[PDB]
Design a protein around this ligand. Structure first.
Ligand code: ZN
Length: 68
């Protein structure tokens, strides 16, 4: 829960909608469907990248500690 609450803020803070309202991103900047794809893939390579590895490592550790 702690890390989830810490990460939800970072997820929203990185949106171009907030950036163009905070002044760092110029208002005359329209996000394209390709930049959205690039950002989503960059996020995915971390989020969905770390999931199967985490599950497999935990399954292996649980099966080792259980003696199977
Ligand atoms: Zn933290």
């Amino acid at each position: 829960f702690h890390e989830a609450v810490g990460e939800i803020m970072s997820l929203s803070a990185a949106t171009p909608k907030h950036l163009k309202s905070i002044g760092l991103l110029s208002p005359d900047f329209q996000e394209d469907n390709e930049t959205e794809i690039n950002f989503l893939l960059k996020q995915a390579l971390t989020i969905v990248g770390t999931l199967p590895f985490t599950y497999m490592l935990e399954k292996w550790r649980w099966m080792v500690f259980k003696g199977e």
